[PDB]
Amino acid sequence: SKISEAVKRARAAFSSGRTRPLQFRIQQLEALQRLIQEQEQELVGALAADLHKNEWNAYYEEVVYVLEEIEYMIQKLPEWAADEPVEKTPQTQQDELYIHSEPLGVVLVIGTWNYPFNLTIQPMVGAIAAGNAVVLKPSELSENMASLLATIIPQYLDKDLYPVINGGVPETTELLKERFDHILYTGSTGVGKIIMTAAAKHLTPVTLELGGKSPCYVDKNCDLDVACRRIAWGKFMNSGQTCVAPDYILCDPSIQNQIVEKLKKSLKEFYGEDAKKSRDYGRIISARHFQRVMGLIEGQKVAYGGTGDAATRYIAPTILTDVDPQSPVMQEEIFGPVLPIVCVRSLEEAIQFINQREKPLALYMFSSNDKVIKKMIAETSSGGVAANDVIVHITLHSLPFGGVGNSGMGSYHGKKSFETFSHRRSCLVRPLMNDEGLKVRYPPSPA
């Protein structure tokens, strides 16, 4: 099959040793930099057609992070790839002890549709830097980006090492029968289980970046003007379609109306009176998802928004009040521009609420009280945490990005990408000279 042949060619190119010199890896990273610069308008056009992004947010909410990762990895690669001496003991003073990093082989990256350039290419950057071949499977839901990447990746990168596999679910299923040395998947919790099951057939390690509902606790006595503008930015970027969007708010009933008012103020600042006319507001990816999200508004009290246009997949920025946690909007990841507010009567109740649910990819809290922030962190579990902001924690080189429990396993970004896509091999090198200190270990044992 075309899929088997592409994987075979990637594996043969890897086994040849081509990717082992750092110079080769850096040439391919530099070719990706050239791709991003030269294909800027094409990338914008694809993101506009798939998701109703514009030239500014295509770059500053997505493509820029890929460029930043490439530049940082090129700079750090020689230090990261070096053998790393480790601590000795009195018995091993004359030995060399070190961790050797080496590629895994052929890595598969399965992209997702909501940031279809970042979530295909940013993982690829780390896997290239670690010396692997990298097979890419873009999501078919972001059809324009998928088509674009199939054309431009082989225009810039080695054609055997870094192939792009076209198609949808059947092609991904077929691809998952192939033998890889690591799989990174971004997507749903349910498909994560399918990926891990396929990986098990070849003992392939996985990095799974999955889902959940990221809570956003807002403390009673905090600056709501600052808080709600930050929350609205993260919730409504990309029309709500972000893995670490603040999915829902938990707050004391006494500040619910203040939160609604300040979110509304920020939304009008951001997108005007009619967000359908804002160049900065996105659209839902597909008709299925449009219908799903609109269904989540049914039965709810709409404090703002609540309307949609099926033909162009516009959903107005929507705020829901006094939401029943058992209702549908509170029983699935929303992934759209619908923000429910759930009342809780204390920090302790908020912590209980979060812990009774599955572990989220992100947890957010807004408070001016350092003790509240430390307590909530200490008593909950999530992939990552931001206090007093949203989104930003997954964009930083020094903070590995990943989930826990149902939100995933493993992590990447920065140095952690290099580690994730390598094998870290413990090495002990001893002199081949008689050593009296060793003879105690040989039989016969002493009486």
For residues 285 and 238, give the distance between their C-alpha atoms in angstroms, rounded to a whole number. 10
Encode burial over 298-321: b for 16+ CB neighbours within 10 A, e otherwise. Answer: eebeebbbbebeeeebbbbbbbbb
Residue 384: contacted member of a copy of itself, K ion, none (CB under 5 to 8 Å, by partner type): a copy of itself
Using rule CB under 8 A, residue 122 touches a copy of itself: no
| Contacting residue, 193, 291, 345, 348, with a copy of itself by CB under 8 A | 193
**Looking only at residues 8 through 37 of this chain, which bind a copy of itself when binding is defined by CB under 8 A?**
15, 20
Query: Rule CB under 8 A: is residue 411 a binding residue for a copy of itself?
Result: yes
User: 280 to 339, contacts with a copy of itself by CB under 8 A?
Assistant: 280-281
Q: Which of 4, 75, 177, 200 binds a copy of itself (CB under 8 A)?
A: 200
Site for a copy of itself in 419-438 (CB under 8 A): 423-434, 438
- Per CB under 8 A, the list member of 164, 316, 385, 421 interacting with a copy of itself is 385
Residue 170: name its binding partner from K ion, a copy of itself, none (Cβ under 5 to 8 Å by kind): none
Task: Flag whether 188 is marked binding.
Answer: yes
413, with CB counted inside 10 A (0-12, 13-18, 19+), is: buried
Query: Which of these is catalytic: 209, 216, 228, 333?
Result: 209
- 347 part of the interface to a copy of itself, by CB under 8 A: no
Query: Which of the listed partners (a copy of itself, K ion, none) does 82 bind, with a CB threshold of 5 to 8 Å by partner kind?
Result: K ion
Residues near K ion, by CB under 5 A: 82, 84, 301, 322, 439, 442
The stretch among 113-121, 136-144, 318-326, 370-378 that binds a copy of itself (CB under 8 A) is 370-378
Counting residues that bind a copy of itself (by CB under 8 A) gives 97
Q: How far is the CB of 15 from K ion (least distance, A)?
A: 24
189 is in an annotated binding site: yes
> Is residue 228 annotated as a catalytic residue, yes or no?
no
List the single partner that 301 binds among a copy of itself, K ion, none, CB under 5 to 8 Å by kind: K ion
Options 19, 28, 39, 57; binder of a copy of itself; rule CB under 8 A: 57
Give the nearer residue to a copy of itself in terms of CB position, either 159 or 423.
423
d(CA 157, CA 300): 50
Contact region with a copy of itself (CB under 8 A), list: 24-32, 109-117, 137-145, 218-226? 218-226
Binding at 431: pick from K ion, a copy of itself, none (beta carbon under 5-8 Å per type) = a copy of itself
251 counts as binding a copy of itself under rule CB under 8 A: no
End-to-end Cα distance, the chain:
66
CB of 285 to K ion, least distance (A): 26
Catalytic site residue 209? yes
Exactly one of 100, 265, 292, 301 binds a copy of itself (CB under 8 A); that residue is: 100
Q: How far is the CB of 301 from K ion (least distance, A)?
A: 4
User: Which residue in the set 26, 31, 49, 99 belongs to the binding site for a copy of itself (CB under 8 A)?
Assistant: 99
- Residues annotated within a binding site: 187-192
- Residues annotated within a binding site for NAD(+): 187-192
Q: Which residues are catalytic?
A: 209, 243
